[PDB]
Amino acid sequence: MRVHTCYFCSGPVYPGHGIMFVRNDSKVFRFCRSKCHKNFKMKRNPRKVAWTKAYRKAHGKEMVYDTALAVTAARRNVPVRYDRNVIATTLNAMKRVSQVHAKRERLFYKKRLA
Amino acid sequence: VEDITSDKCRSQLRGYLKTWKADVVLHDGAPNVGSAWLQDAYGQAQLVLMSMKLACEFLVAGGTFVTKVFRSRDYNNLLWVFKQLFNKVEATKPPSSRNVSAEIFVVCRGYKAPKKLDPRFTDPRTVFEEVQEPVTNVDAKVFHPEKRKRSREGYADDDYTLHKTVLASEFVTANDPIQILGTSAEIVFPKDDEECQRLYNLDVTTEEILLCCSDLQVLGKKEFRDILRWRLKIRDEMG
Amino acid sequence: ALRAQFENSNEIGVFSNLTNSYALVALGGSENFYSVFEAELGDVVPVVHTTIGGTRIIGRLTCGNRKGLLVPSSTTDNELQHLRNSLPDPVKIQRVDERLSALGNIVACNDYVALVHPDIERETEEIIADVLDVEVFRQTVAGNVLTGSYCALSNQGALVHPRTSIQEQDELSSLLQVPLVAGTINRGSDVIGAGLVVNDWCAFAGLDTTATELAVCESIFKLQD
Amino acid sequence: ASGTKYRMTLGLPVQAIMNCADNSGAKNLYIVSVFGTGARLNRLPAASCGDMVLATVKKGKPDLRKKIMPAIVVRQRKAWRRKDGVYLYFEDNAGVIVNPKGEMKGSAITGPVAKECADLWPRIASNAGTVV
Amino acid sequence: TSGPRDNNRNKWAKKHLKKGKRAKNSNFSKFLKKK
RNA sequence: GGAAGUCGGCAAAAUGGGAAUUCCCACUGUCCCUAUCUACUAUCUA
RNA sequence: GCCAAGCGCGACGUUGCUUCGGCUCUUCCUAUCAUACCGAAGCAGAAUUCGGUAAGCGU
RNA sequence: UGUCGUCGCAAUGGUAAUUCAACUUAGUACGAGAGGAACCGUUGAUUCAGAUCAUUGGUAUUUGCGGCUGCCUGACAAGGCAAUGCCGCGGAGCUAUCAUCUGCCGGAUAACGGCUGAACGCCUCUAAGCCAGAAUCCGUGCCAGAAAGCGACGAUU
């Protein structure tokens, strides 16, 4: 159960939603909706499309990074042994990261408005 | 009552031929219907060629071979073999032959009487070998990310990995960027190449251009034009 | 050597993966196939009743040795975690973001030396060297790039196409530092990797493998004693 | 064939020319008949990923052409829904030349391999390079 | 193959019902029933 | 998907093209297999 | 023709060579191709052959 | 049927599911070998039927938003336009084996296999009797509800 990121909108793609597209280079494009899928079909550049996350990232409208709580998430290809206490701590860690990430989400907007 | 080209019947034909030699040969090879037209067309054409094999074996100089053929794309190739192996070609449709069908009677008169039957002609692989055409209009694909025109020819002539990559130095130096973009999946920028390292450090090259080269396939007409203008500027810089 | 069959399919190599420290079998199918492996390796190495990417072709989709295991990037997270729980700790498990997800089909690896696909990515080769701790050779088997499927490789023996030349046979055996035999399995099935799985002490062949082929693999593998 | 095959959207009807993905030398496959077609009135038989159909080699070697003989579809243009809910579609309609037993005549394939085709045909999965 | 009105199949369906299959169903009703 | 429709490329889209009525290529709701929209008709009222 | 129970015929037997024409459609019939169940056969098994019940359901 | 309404009853009429191959039983029964079953159980898929719109595709008069061309206000801007000018996206609705769900149980028989058992001191599946038994038959279930079939209940100008 993985919530993937759309190639175009960089938004959350959940099971059932959107489309998955495989290229001859075995590379997989997942689209959150038909609008993003068609935009890939006309091959519009995400950074050049005004509403995409890639545009909002590489135009100064969103933060380069946030090491909130020194870590937020990562693509871990090495599986980890289960532990109830560890699975507990990360869940508390996740909400703490989200709250702090929400905190910077507000100051930065104040900075841009200023 | 035997096969047309069997070794035994060929012995019987030459057994009756004796001092005489085959002057005119008629052929009415007719495969059954009930399959693809292309299958039936090639089934008739191969049976014509493979029956044309026994002809040159048995035919006298200046002989005539009248055979029924099914018109197809291989029909032009079959006429070519007829032209080299016979002096005159008389492909025609008699009034009695049904016009709705492709029964064409080719009269190959004036047998060339070659010294020996050419192995290329004997072998159907060589005769019906698909002849390559001029370079595919890959510039149209470059200029038009749209127009999905049902491309169906093969897979780049036995190309195992379709993710073809082209060196940055090779792409810049080459005089045919249109075919590079049309054929290559991406313009690779390996770190080992000293020229590629120069290309990264070049002020003209930008992050968008690097992203465009990383994924050529997901690019519009304007992005391709910008890459083409970029490579020309690099070419102007080198000389 | 033992004759085993998955359902009515003799290509047990496709539906299961065998190593020198663990065994991999499909999920949700006939329990007889898992029991066959358990009867011969249950008390030796753990056997994992798992599937990859929701597929029963885990044998040809996964590549690994007795130390480590590799799965394609298409492997689901739930499948990846399930492998870690079942497999023991000294067995590393690693994902591979490769253009060719058929890792088992493209890489034929034993515990010590591995032969990989000629077009395998450099990052994949680095990951193989890190996790498998094996020397990686980029070559081909009998002129066919699918080394993992056209070559059955073990510590004390290897099997390749019967069409390979003698000098190619000797060169491959010298490179693989192992005795190697050019032969066929499953009564003419030239895909030895698909029809044969062998560890360092036992071999498993398809139910359609001839007795002559069974005698041959036992002799080259020296597993009679 | 090994194991049951789930129903998926059909997008390769008869009278279709499709790309031949193996290294046997064939280029274009022409669909003439589809195995396992019921008596449906005025319905064109159709093919999907992993389905075996009678195909004729339009382009390729003269020797293997003129054989109406089964081919397994490995990639389908039309979007189809996997039972997990996600939708997939490939750019090209790719098929592999196979004997009735279930073994590919060629030695290697080109392009991604649909997983549904891979699980259905173990020999195809054995000869597959990228199962996506 | 026979349909759903096959007499032998209806016999076999009874044999499923006369075992824990219908049983599991009875107390499953009893649980929500005593609720 | 691409003439598999029908006695048949009739009408559309393609631009229609190439080669000897035929073949090849392209094209399309002709067909699989229909679905949606619009105006008018149709309906009721004086 | 030979017999020939019988009532000159004479049964069964026996000898003698020898305009029409087809698409869709609706139902219906069984004189049943398949599906369901039985019977017989040197029917080992498997695949059949033949014969019954049978028009529910397809073709 | 006082009147109106609610909740039901059910005479009768229609009916619906079809077929396949995969797992296990198996490489067992059986077979010199070659080969190779089936029942129970299980999973899918065809044809058909009844629905449905979560997801996907299609649809565009949402004339919803944006872009382009041209036109009109002296200019800028501002707008408005153009038989629905052109293009992209587009909810909502409709819709698609281009998407998804669901598709039931009792007896009674035919062929046939028998039980007891006379006729006929034996025998006999049959005469009187009785079991087993077909996708068959009749029910169940599902659809309608007699607009001159009916019940209980509520209140009463």
Cα–Cα nearest to D94, from D33, D12, D24, D35:
D12
- List all residues of chain C from 20 to 79 with a beta carbon under 8 Å from chain A: 76-78
Q: CA–CA separation, C124 vs C130, rounded Å?
A: 10
B205 Cβ neighbours under 8 A, 6+ residues apart = B199, B230, B234
Q: CA–CA separation, C122 vs C174, rounded Å?
A: 24
Residue D77, SS3 per DSSP: coil
What are the structure tokens assigned to C136, written together?
A: 């990686």
Q: CA–CA separation, D9 vs D76, rounded Å?
A: 10
Q: Is the CB of residue B147 inside 7 Å of nucleic acid strand F?
A: no
C84 CB within 8 Å of a chain A CB: yes
Residue D1, SS3 per DSSP: coil
Cα–Cα nearest to B180, from B215, B148, B142:
B142
Q: CA–CA separation, C155 vs C200, rounded Å?
A: 6
Strand partners, D56: D30
DSSP assignment of chain B? ---TT-HHHHHHHHHHHTTS-EEEEEE---PPSSS-HHHHHHHHHHHHHHHHHHHHHHEEEEEEEEEEEE-SSHHHHHHHHHHHHEEEE--B--SSS-SSS-EEEEEEEEE---SS--HHHH-HHHHTPPPPPSPP-HHHHHH-S-------S-STTT-S----EEEHHHHHH-S-HHHHHHH-SEEE--SS-HHHHHHHH-SS--HHHHHHHHTSSS--HHHHHHHHHHHHHHHHHH-
Q: CA–CA separation, C220 vs C199, rounded Å?
A: 13
Instruction: Give the DSSP H/E element, type plus range, for residue E10.
Output: helix E7-17
Q: CA–CA separation, A57 vs A73, rounded Å?
A: 18
Q: Is the CB of residue B80 inside 7 Å of nucleic acid strand F?
A: no
Please check whether residue B138 is in contact with residue B165, taking contact to mean a CB–CB distance below 8 angstroms: no
Q: CA–CA separation, C79 vs B126, rounded Å?
A: 52
Residue carrying the six token digits 């009930």? B34
Please check whether residue B37 is in contact with residue B44, taking contact to mean a CB–CB distance below 8 angstroms: no
Please check whether residue B114 is in contact with residue B56, taking contact to mean a CB–CB distance below 8 angstroms: yes
> What phi and psi values does residue C164 have, to the nearest 5 degrees?
-70, 145
In chain A, what's the furthest Cα-to-Cα distance? 49
What are the structure tokens assigned to A42, written together?
A: 């006309």
C119 CB within 8 Å of a chain B CB: yes
Please check whether residue C24 is in contact with residue C41, taking contact to mean a CB–CB distance below 8 angstroms: no
What does the DSSP 8-state code read for residue E17? H
Strand partners, B59: B22
Contacts 24+ apart (CB under 8 A), C167-172: C168/C142, C172/C139, C172/C141
B219 CB within 8 Å of a chain A CB: yes
Q: Which among D2, D108, D130 is the nearest to C8, CB-wise? A: D2
Q: CA–CA separation, C55 vs C50, rounded Å?
A: 9
Spans of all domains in chain C: 1-222
Strand partners, D97: D71
Q: CA–CA separation, D111 vs C124, rounded Å?
A: 19
C220 Cβ neighbours under 8 A, 6+ residues apart = C157, C159, C179, C181
Chain B's closest residue to A47, CA to CA, is B208
Angle at D74 between CA D70 and CA D76, to 5 degrees: 110
Chains E and C physically touch (3 or more Cβ atom pairs below 8 Å): no
Q: Give the A:D interface size as CB pairs under 8 Å.
A: 28
Please check whether residue C1 is in contact with residue C220, taking contact to mean a CB–CB distance below 8 angstroms: no
Resolution (A): 2.8
Contacts of C72 in chain D (CB under 8 A): 131
Q: CA–CA separation, B49 vs B215, rounded Å?
A: 49
Residue D116, SS3 per DSSP: helix
Which conformational region is residue B26 in: left (phi greater than 0), alpha (psi within -120 to 50 degrees), or beta? beta
Residue carrying the six token digits 């039936």? B40
Alpha carbon dihedral B96, B98, B99, B101, in 10-degree steps, equals -150
What does the DSSP 8-state code read for residue D84? T
- Between the CA of residue D92 and those of B75, B81, D12, what are the distances in Å? 29, 35, 11
Q: What is the CA radius of gyration of chain C?
A: 16
DSSP assignment of chain A? ---EE-TTT--EE-TTSSEEEE-TTS-EEEESSHHHHHHHHTT--GGGSTTSHHHHHTTSSS-S---GGG-------S-----HHHHHHHHHHHHHHHHHHHHHHHHHHHHHH-
Q: After which residues is chain A broken (C to N over 2.5 A)?
A: none
Q: CA–CA separation, C204 vs C37, rounded Å?
A: 9
E9 Cβ neighbours under 8 A, 6+ residues apart = E2
Q: Is the CB of residue D44 inside 7 Å of nucleic acid strand F?
A: yes
SS (H, E, C) chain C: CEEECECCECCHHHHEEECCCCEEECCCCCHHHHHHHHHHHCCCCCEEECCECCECCHHHHCEECCCEEEEECCCCHHHHHHHHHHCCCCCEEEEECCCCCCHHHHCEECCCEEEECCCCCHHHHHHHHHHHCCEEEECCECCECCHHHHCEECCCCEEECCCCCHHHHHHHHHHCCCCEEECCECCCECCHHHHEEECCCCEEEECCCCHHHHHHHHHHHCCCC
Residue carrying the six token digits 């100064």? A60
Residue carrying the six token digits 């280029």? D27
Q: Choosing among C7, C55, C57, C187, which should be mutated to test the D contact, i.e. which has the most D CBs within 10 A?
A: C57
Q: CA–CA separation, E35 vs E26, rounded Å?
A: 14
What does the DSSP 8-state code read for residue D22? B
Q: CA–CA separation, C53 vs C82, rounded Å?
A: 12
Please check whether residue A19 is in contact with residue D87, taking contact to mean a CB–CB distance below 8 angstroms: yes
B28 labelled binding-site residue: yes
Domain that holds residue D119: 1-132
Cα–Cα nearest to A31, from A15, A51, A46, A13:
A13
Q: Is the CB of residue D55 inside 7 Å of nucleic acid strand F?
A: no
Beta carbons of C99 and B161 less than 8 Å apart: yes
Cα–Cα nearest to D117, from D34, D69, D47, D13:
D47
Q: CA–CA separation, B197 vs A113, rounded Å?
A: 40
Method: cryo-EM
Active site annotation includes B149: no
Contacts 24+ apart (CB under 8 A), A42-45: A42/B145, A42/B146, A42/B220, A43/B145, A43/B217, A43/B218, A43/B219, A43/B220, A43/B223, A44/B220, A45/B208, A45/B219, A45/B220, A45/B223
Length of chain C, in residues: 225
Residue D34, class by beta-carbon neighbours within 10 Å (0-12 exposed, 13-18 middle, 19+ buried)? buried
Residue carrying the six token digits 């016979």? B86
Distance of C1' in H85 from CA in A35, Å = 26
Structural domain count of chain D: 1
Residue C76, class by beta-carbon neighbours within 10 Å (0-12 exposed, 13-18 middle, 19+ buried)? middle
